[PDB]
């Protein structure tokens, strides 16, 4: 298994510095190029940097020329991206990726990626969310009943919601967070079920907010 | 070297033939790659060196070069193919990406299931109130949700959010939140959301009485 795991992001104030790590397994990072690709919220892909660790050859983009530096420790098989003088336009999800090459030299592409890591550049403060149950109702409309959870008043992104620790998946709809008038984020995550099923199986939503170290498992119930 | 991607977005039925084109500001060799990105996930390499399929990629994806233009084609669009597709020019020491083409599916009209959630007591004790209206598996995405407190149409105190297209039935879902002070929430009683959508002959109203 070729695997790449990012780490080291989160909230950082403007003008700050942050070092992201990309731990690689299943291959030696000296074998290939290692790339950093960033994506602003609701925008397109943008190449940040690339490194050949074995020979130490660096390659950057003009947007991050003087501030961003890409390092690599083969002892740890880990790439690093240190970012200085961070502006608000640096707010993005940062992926690390491996470049594979056509054996001939035709050109190749990024075959394996990481999960990405959100880097928010903002003077605002981290705040944990509050989780409230959106309880099922008397209504039955098509014989359908919805329940859910409301994660409210949190900074920054992201939070992750699952239902019964990922066991419950069908009928789930988790909505994108929306910036409130408060300057804080808040979202909902609902699940549809048959009305007769309400008395049988239990429903728990797991809310996770790592910038605040908030882990809540809230049980939703009728009435 | 830059990549101009057309179209900006497109809408197509299951089974159609979809084509996405990237033009290069300067001449480039056949070092174009095609990636697919589903929402909230890392991009997946579909095609490399303009015309070659990466392994595991279905045969419905194909790549072609016409001089300075590069084309990715889906022969028969599937519901799971909803995604933003990107083109990349580069060799591993510098790559530039296209702006991306968002591809969504066209399907038959589906009417939303509509549900209403009153604020929790736990939230009222916090001094705020959030009433949530949910629309479930409706297509098309265009819909209007209007909040009525005591049969009075409100404005400016509610925010909505929409999921991305489902990958099996190609539908959307919406969530509208009316946010009021515990005081103004307790000063009224009847709370309703009225949904107007194409699949609904007459608009649907879901409501509750506080307590």
Author numbering:
A (entry chain H): 1 to 141, 143 to 224
B (entry chain L): 2 to 212
What does the literature reporting this entry say, word for word?
The S protein is composed of two subunits, S1 and S2. In the receptor binding domain, a neutralizing epitope is captured in the end distal to the receptor binding site, reminiscent of the locations of the SARS-CoV-2 RBD cryptic epitopes.
We used a phage-displayed library (library F) of synthetic, human antigen-binding fragments (Fabs) to select for antibodies that could recognize 229E S trimer. Among the nine Fabs that bound the S1 subunit, only Fab C04 recognized RBD while the other eight antibodies all bound NTD. To understand if its low neutralizing activity correlates with its mode of action, we then determined the crystal structure of Fab C04 alone and C04 in complex with 229E RBD. Among these CDR loops, CDRH3 is of particular interest as it contains as many as five Gly residues within the CDRH3 loop, which likely endows it with great structural plasticity to neatly fit itself into a pocket on RBD surface, through largely backbone driven interactions. The structural plasticity of CDRH3 is also well demonstrated by its large conformational change upon binding RBD. While the RMSD of CDRH3 reached 1.51 Å upon RBD binding, the average RMSD of CDRL1, CDRL3 and CDRH2 was only 0.66 Å.
